[PDB]
Structure 1
């Protein structure tokens, strides 16, 4: 019952709104992208506040903000 609507921008392109949860970890967010854009999970990597965040921890702690614009980055 905790659907967090965050904004994820494709590096420089479109800012897409993603349906995540507080029960979901950042690792699971990566895994979602891994299902679509999963081309080597070390070539694509998402970072928000300039940090890679702790994918060990749930997205609730960092992504609680619906304005949290996570940038889908490419290495």
Structure 2
């Protein structure tokens, strides 16, 4: 599957989807082309401008081989205030950026809570956060609540 990507603020380039033919794989190929995090990519159908739905298959949104998608990169990486609730249900406020790793947040929580980093993990809406992934890949927002879970 070969697709044209047209960036509003710049270049047009080709990508190939040879695995899942999903939005997730389209975003990953764009990362290889322009070095931008998947969670910062905004995509629409060319030329309608209708936004891509992140869980609907590409085939059902009018897209396949030879289709064109519009791409813009969200320029926003300002700090945002989230909550992390400790083992006793006490929440503390943390300033994070979506380009920081889960490991960055775990360092902040480790210091404020006084719990060595390997004695806990973090969950958002029940899903575990992985140290190496950016906070942005979990859809954290201003006022998101994250849970500290002890071993």
TM-score, L = length of structure 1: 0.75
SS at match of 1:30: helix
Aligned length: 75
Aligned mate of 2:145, from 69, 72, 75: 69
- Any stretches of 5+ residues in structure 1 without a counterpart? none
Q: CA RMSD in A?
A: 2.0
> What whole-Å deviation, never above 9, does each CA across 1:13-61 have from its counterpart, x for those lacking one?
3111111111211111112233444644221222222222232211123
For structure 2, which runs of at least 5 residues remain unmatched after alignment?
A: 1-76
What's the offset of the Cα at 1:10?
1.0
Contact 1:47 1:72 in 2 (8 A): yes
Which 4+ runs in 1 deviate beyond 3 A?
34-40
